[PDB]
Amino acid sequence: MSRLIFEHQRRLTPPTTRKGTITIEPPPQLPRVTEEVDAERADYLRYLSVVRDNVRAHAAEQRAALEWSHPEPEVLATIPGTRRQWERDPRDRDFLVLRAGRHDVPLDAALKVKDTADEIDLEPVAHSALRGLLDVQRTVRDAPTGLDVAKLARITVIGEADEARAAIRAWIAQAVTWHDPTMLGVALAAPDLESGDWSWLKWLPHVDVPNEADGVGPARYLTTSTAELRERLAPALADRPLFPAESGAALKHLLVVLDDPDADPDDIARKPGLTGVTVIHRTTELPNREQYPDPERPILRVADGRIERWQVGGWQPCVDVADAMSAAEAAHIARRLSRWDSN
């Protein structure tokens, strides 16, 4: 839904991250059976300090890359109408990943130590410093992490209505303001679409069904029940293989969101699912030892700004500061996006 044309030029290259695996020489072995060992550990600890600095530079580089790709939601209002408006294209490593908050994501350049001996027959101070370094430095701190749409088929979002809709709005905004309308579509089958928590999609030029016009403007995917939604959605995913298998066709890994907690998501997709469908449906029926760590159908609940997954038992924290946005910010973004289309 736009009365103006957008043209896709070269994506602005992100800050260059690299995967140079840093190798660390093991601690010196203790005297095989004192200034000697003092100088030894002094040399090792200086080497360790500089390699600490180096790996911290690697981590800050990774984090700057991830923050270039996943900005804070409040920034998204400035993206549209810019050289970077829909930059991610299916060659990028950040395609179809939507930020869900800041969490400690492990390093992208795994540290290593040459495997010769890893016992405590080594220097106490040197080996202690190395173990501490390797224990903390695994992760970068508070980097924007996200959900990979391509490897998801049902994202059952347990939780309070307000916070659940906040997180879902954050994801849908983060997606639709980084992807073309020909590479990502959005559809919503909610009980009521007269309300600001989902009305904002009215402008979004990614809920429009291609080459149909119902009422004013091009016809939109917003509906009032899963049955009517699937009716309006069939000839845009009823040519697609099953979800796990691969396809060679160009296709939109579109989003479908079912605000209705009652609605069973089996009335849009099938049980194995479709390729390029992401059923982001909220419910309230909590699970209990329904063990499914499968990262293709995750059950994640938002509590007070912290999204928790259901891996194998108990709620395991997946993020720490779960991003969220209002209906107002989403309305503003949706307006600023309705000025461009290529569909």
Binding site: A213, G217, A331, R335
Partner: protein, 113 residues
Amino acid sequence: MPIVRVAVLAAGDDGGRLTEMALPSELPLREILPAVQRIVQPALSLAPIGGAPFSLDATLDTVGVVDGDLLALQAVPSGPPAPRIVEDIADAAVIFSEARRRQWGPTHIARGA
């Protein structure tokens, strides 16, 4: 399609409300203004937020508008609409540094005490 889906803000008597509405883009405003008047406020022209109001003898397309723009319902100026003039500022640090200055405020009295 000759449609533009704009978000007109209402005549505030309870607060401004972004009533979204679709407007025929190729039609002169003399016919759609009474309609949108009926819509936004249950019962004179449109203007971009900071800009100058559009002429009643024009079309939304010609003055230029797109499906995401915000139009406020105002009344055309009695006299001629006048341009805004930009004052070139060559240093903002001094305005900020002197706006952070108060002559003998209660803070000075606290310091002296």
